[PDB]
Design a protein around this nucleic acid. Sequence first.
RNA 1: CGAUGUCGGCUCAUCACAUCCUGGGGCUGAAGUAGGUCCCAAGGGUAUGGCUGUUCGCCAUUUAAAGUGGUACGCGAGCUGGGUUUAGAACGUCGUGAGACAGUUCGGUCCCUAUCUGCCGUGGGCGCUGGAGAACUGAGGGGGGCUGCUCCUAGUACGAGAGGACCGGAGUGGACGCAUCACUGGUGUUCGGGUUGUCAUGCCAAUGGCACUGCCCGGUAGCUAAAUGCGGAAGAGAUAAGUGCUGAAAGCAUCUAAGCACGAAACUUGCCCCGAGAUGAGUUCUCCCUGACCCUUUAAGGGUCCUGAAGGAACGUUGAAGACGACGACGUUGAUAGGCCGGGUGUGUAAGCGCAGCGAUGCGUUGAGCUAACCGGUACUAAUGAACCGUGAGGCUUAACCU
RNA 2: AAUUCCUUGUCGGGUAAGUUCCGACCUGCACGAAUGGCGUAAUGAUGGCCAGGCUGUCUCCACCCGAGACUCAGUGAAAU
RNA 3: ACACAGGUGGUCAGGUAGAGAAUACCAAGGCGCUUGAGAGAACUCGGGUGAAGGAACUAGGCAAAAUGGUGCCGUAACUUC
Lengths: 114, 209, 56, 120, 122
Amino acid sequence: SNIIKQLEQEQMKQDVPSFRPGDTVEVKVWVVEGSKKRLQAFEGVVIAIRNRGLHSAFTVRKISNGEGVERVFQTHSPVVDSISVKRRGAVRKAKLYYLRERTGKAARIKERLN
Amino acid sequence: MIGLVGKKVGMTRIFTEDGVSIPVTVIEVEANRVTQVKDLANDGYRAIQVTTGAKKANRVTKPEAGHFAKAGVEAGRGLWEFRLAEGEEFTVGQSISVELFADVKKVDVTGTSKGKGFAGTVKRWNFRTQDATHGNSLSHRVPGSIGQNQTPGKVFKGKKMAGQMGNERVTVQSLDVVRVDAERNLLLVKGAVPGATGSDLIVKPAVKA
Amino acid sequence: AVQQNKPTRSKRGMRRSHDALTAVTSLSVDKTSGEKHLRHHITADGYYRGRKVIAK
Amino acid sequence: MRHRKSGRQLNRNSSHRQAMFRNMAGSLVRHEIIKTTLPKAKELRRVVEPLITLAKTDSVANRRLAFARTRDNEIVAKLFNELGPRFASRAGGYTRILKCGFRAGDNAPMAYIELVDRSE
Amino acid sequence: MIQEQTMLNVADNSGARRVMCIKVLGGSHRRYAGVGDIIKITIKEAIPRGKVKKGDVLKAVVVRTKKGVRRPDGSVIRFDGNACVLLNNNSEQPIGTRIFGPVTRELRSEKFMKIISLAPEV
RNA sequence: CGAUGUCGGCUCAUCACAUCCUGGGGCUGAAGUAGGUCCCAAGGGUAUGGCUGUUCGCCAUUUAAAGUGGUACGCGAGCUGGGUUUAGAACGUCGUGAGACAGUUCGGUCCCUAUCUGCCGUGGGCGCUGGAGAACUGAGGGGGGCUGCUCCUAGUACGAGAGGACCGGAGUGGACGCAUCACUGGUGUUCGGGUUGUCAUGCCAAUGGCACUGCCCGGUAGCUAAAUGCGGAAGAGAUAAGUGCUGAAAGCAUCUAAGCACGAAACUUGCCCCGAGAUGAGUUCUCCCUGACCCUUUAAGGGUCCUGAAGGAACGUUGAAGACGACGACGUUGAUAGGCCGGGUGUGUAAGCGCAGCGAUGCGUUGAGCUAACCGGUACUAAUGAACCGUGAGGCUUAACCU
RNA sequence: AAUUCCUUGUCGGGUAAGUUCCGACCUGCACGAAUGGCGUAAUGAUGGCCAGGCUGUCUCCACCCGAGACUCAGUGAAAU
RNA sequence: ACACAGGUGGUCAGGUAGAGAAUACCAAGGCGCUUGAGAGAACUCGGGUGAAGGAACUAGGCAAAAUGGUGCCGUAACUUC
């Protein structure tokens, strides 16, 4: 039924970037706490991103030592305000999972400059 | 006021500002052809035949076709009927849409629940698996007991045993409508309805508020 | 006992009443050969629908 | 029942199913018609049809394509050079199946599978 | 999960860092604890510089888990390991004077007042 | 005693009510909040951890509550096999001794190709009265009948004060069911890439075979909880305990006699499913069949001529059907399924070519090469035009109207 | 305790609880110095206990693969 | 008993890898396990991968799992040194 294949495109956002693992994109969310509308940024590196169109997956990890946080955001989520785009990373894995157990000097990556 | 027939066609998500994914069942409803309104034709009451659609002209049967032959010689793909009490109706060539629900709340749906073949036990009756060590005597996926020694000399009627899942409907009553779109055939209901994508669905207002 | 009394010869026949020998009905006649066959298989003379599919 | 996962299993392992239908596809190139079991006739296609489609478009060089299989001197010479110009005008539909009863009773179901273009 | 025999990090000062879970609290036939829920915990090493002793059993609130949370914001949030806050044996609420790492705010009961008010968590 | 395998445990049952928890009522040496107590009640709910071979027991932590019990103190052709109760040996000890010990310590045998009933799932034959299709009705059955916290009532009634309520709607968890793969994890021997050793193509390149999917990293479709969503409502009928009115036996009194209304979480329903073999086979709608001759003690047979519907199956393409059947879409008056084409997801920039480096190897022509289930195009391939069963208006009586 | 019935004794160490263990006490139904009495390097596919590691043993199993099973064509038993 | 996954003294020692008659691929040389064909059910024998914890299991951490190579550094208590 083509209605499903309509609804998965006609809901796509029109101010969203295309980005990769190892990037840092400075995502912002509304928090949805109290009547005084908040805004919160989550800082860290992209470990998984795209593709499912509207449904596309997007996960960020803080990689802080000795302990940090990993969060799922999803590029078209109703609660995401913005994706700001900050730094690049030089990594070839489509899933950054070899880094997902690192936090020390083994977690430093090249920022895709030449 | 009566009900409608359509098809599941898939699972989808609601994209709510509560951040949760929340499932919604699509339910695609082509306008039901309402090919006959009855006047005291059996058991002293009034009813309407809602008619889900039609059949391919090359694959028609004579005893099925005669039920729709005044509206067309192409059958109806669903000989469903409903009681007429909330109105007075006459038979015309205008199909009824999901606009029937534009001021309605809380509905119930008959589906075509999970066809799993054999189904077994762990995925039929939520059974558990027995101790897999100290040496296992061909007794890993076994029920334990099914009864008790000699006094009954039988298994009880309505015992849980292995047996298939399929050839079943199931009716779900915790539903309400979201889209009601007579221009997209899109009913859209809160939560997940029984059966796979090809399941044929019957919807009406629920008596539970 | 392993069996308490040997079964009646009726029980043997009642299984055979659900064991109908497949013998197939409505044999098709070929459009070029002198053979008859099953509707979707080749004749023993190498013809199908009167077309000579194989040598003999 | 596993009916939503589509594909015929047909015996042993994917290494023997590679080797046997690769050998039998070599024999199909020799005779252009083969008699075997009705399930085998359906799965033989999956070696033969890609080698005919590999020759569908005419383009120079790159004869290294697929050159680790069907390399016997009695049939390798027909790859591109006959598998192209005998089917490349038809736009698919290279082969047809026809049942032929059973084997020696020994009740295995038999079929003939042929190419839609055969030469003698 | 946060379940029986699970070794955990204590979000409390002056004592030792290692503590062990023995069971889940509140409701019937309880397996597994989620973030904002209560457990009964053992003091595994204590240290003489803390306010509780080795082999004593206290009440604690689950504040972080390696699989974390997925119901409040709807999207999954995951931590690096597992930690809980340690409650006063009579007065309740945290026994120490400092709480380490990020903390839940999803629980609503006013018996947790001084940890559900924490501005650094919103 | 020509054997009927055990204690406890795993795992799963069924019943009692002497009710552990739930609802109703009356007292309390019960102000309010409560607890304990008794009278009605069994649909719904009824621990986990440790020591023990162990019921019981004792200890730890908690819960709405940690019921009292029957069944061969249920459940070994269901599982276990520590203690028991042997094959070997050991400590204590009696006796000159073999030996012995409901005294002790280790080591240590659980075999079986299920009958008839049954229970869970699934087909075929007959009958319903000429043959089929599909609904409706509901004689009948199954599903199902708990609970913490939090809000409001209200800091009101009540109470110096400490402390603090009805009614029962709402939110949020727990237990237990029900459903779903759009989410999110995991998998992914029908996808791609990296790679060790060796074998092949004479060598190298390149590609492939073998070695656990040879090893390694991601992954579509498919599936499934470790993921996801949702319940057991409102109202009606009828009750026992019990609360009362009106009132007599008993000129008073009284809740019972007449008369009557109320009263529970149970019961009868409502709801959801299945249900006419409901032979008691209903009711209705839709479809198919419009042929006679001869003979007679016949709600029956004999002879003979002509003649093959509806629908299902066959037949084969096959699906979100599947143990086999059965279901279902389509079948040339053809999108039923491949092939060919295209898109989607996954993989990750190759070989041929050119450049850098002594080289391994890298860069660029090249966002390359590849490919499966996801869902569109295209009759290129196959489901052909048929045929064998199934027939020819279907018995008897009574009532009515016509004759 | 490889030995002690009531008895699951006592205390220190210890475990969330230990009829476990180790050490201490003598508070061993008839342990007791050549079958010795007690320690003890070396040896242990070693009983009673602990920690550290590691896990499909478990919470609780989910998917993937072959070979049986299923179905079919042939050969064709036994207990009873 | 049978053409049965069994028993079985002696002779011989190619190439790559390896220490090797392990093991992995192959010569010379030999064989295709003498009942098979479909289907792709649980369940079952034998394999592969696995979230968040961990012995919470069991009379017994049983069974499984981790470790593991081969060169060098380093190495306690106890001891009859």
